[PDB]
Design a protein around this ligand. Structure first.
Ligand SMILES: O=c1ccn([C@@H]2O[C@H](COP(=O)(O)O)[C@@H](O)[C@H]2O)c(=O)[nH]1
Ligand SMILES: O=c1ccn([C@@H]2O[C@H](COP(=O)(O)O)[C@@H](O)[C@H]2O)c(=O)[nH]1
Lengths: 218, 217
């Protein structure tokens, strides 16, 4: 599995290239894995992935929450890996064929797929939560090795970890701003995803350092 | 929304030159183009303004928005800043995520299209069972634009029943995925067509052919 430094992944959702680059550079000594999503990509272009690789020695996870039909999912994954992303996040709710499409491209291109099971926000309780355990089981059956689960719901994250097993890799967003606790989340997740708590801080480096200090024993 | 010929072109080619050439070849038949991630991630968001400059067509961004509220807001802002007139949003993530998109759309003078049931086989696993409820959620939220499957006319009809005849409904899955143009228009206001047109030997002839088959509609 990817070796995430300090078990901490930066969710870089600033939409300004200059700010995104500045903040990421400031926390570079604490984090070697960065998650770039559509807020930044739709604002600055896919080349931003290239720029991050050039400026920082960081792995890139594209949080594109892929959720289209198989044919379109394949195109999205191909374009994303072509740009330099090490991995891509894919939604499981659209079904097995949509996920399989992403897995096929990842296999062909030598990259990885992370399957998003349950989401961390309140609305996730309406439809996703009830399908989450099955979505996770589906991922296991499809051979998915990397997963994304909610920090905001410890009990749900715990169940997801059981379903996927100890060998699977699990990362979890919702830490900080959304209410999730770093240490508690790491009881089940291999790494925590943190965005606003770090990038909106007056001193992002200090914020990252503080989070790492709180989980030093882990 | 007045869609010419009730036909929306799904421009999923991933080359700027080809995307522009093919769209130009069928411009006389359409005035509404749906641009998705295949083209945007390959050529950049500047392609939206380019389409408006060359064709003056309306642009629907098929971005299947499906993140948390905070991120959905940012995605909608970046999308509308690029010149998109409307954006497609997934309903499965819940009401708060949809509301976030509705807020930005209202602020920038745009429209949100709520995707309730998808057109591919995998949609039967989790989405289909929640589709009717997702549609009712849209109604409760004041959504007036929806997306339903051409591949399942009975499901598309049910969606129309739930949202009423005043709501606007567009439908993908026509052609390549097996959906029929005319049957789909019994329930949807407009059909979305991608590959049947952009992968055709003669895109213009393909578009003309589809329109001929629905001339009476
Ligand atoms: O269930 C999910 C899946 C993805 N994210 C993403 O993870 C990051 C969380 O950032 P923050 O709340 O720490 O600022 C964002 O990029 C967000 O879009 C969630 O928050 N929850
Ligand atoms: O349930 C859905 C929602 C969206 N699309 C999109 O609509 C277009 C259909 O294109 P095609 O099958 O006519 O080529 C594509 O852009 C695809 O991603 C579907 O096909 N089904």
């Amino acid at each position: 599995v990817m070796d995430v430094m300090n078990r901490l992944i930066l969710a870089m959702d600033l939409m300004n290239r200059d700010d995104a680059l500045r903040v990421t550079g400031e926390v570079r000594e604490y984090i070697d894995t960065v998650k770039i999503g559509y807020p930044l990509v739709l604002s600055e272009g896919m080349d931003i992935i290239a720029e991050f690789r050039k400026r920082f020695g960081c792995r890139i996870i594209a949080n594109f929450k892929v959720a289209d039909i198989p044919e379109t999912n394949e195109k999205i994954c191909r374009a994303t890996f072509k740009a330099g992303a090490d991995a891509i996040i894919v939604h499981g709710f659209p079904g097995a064929d949509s996920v399989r499409a992403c897995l096929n491209v990842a296999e062909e291109m030598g990259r990885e797929v992370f399957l998003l099971t349950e989401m961390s926000h309140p609305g996730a309780e309406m439809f996703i939560q009830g399908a989450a355990d099955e979505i996770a089981r589906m991922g296991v059956d499809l051979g998915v090795k990397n997963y994304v689960g909610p920090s905001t719901r410890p009990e749900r994250l715990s169940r997801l970890r059981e379903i996927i097993g100890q060998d699977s890799f699990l990362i979890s967003p919702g830490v900080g701003a959304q209410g999730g606790d770093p240490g508690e989340t790491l009881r089940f997740a291999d790494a925590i995803i943190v965005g606003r708590s770090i990038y909106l801080a007056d001193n992002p480096a200090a914020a990252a350092a503080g989070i790492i200090e709180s989980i030093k024993d882990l």
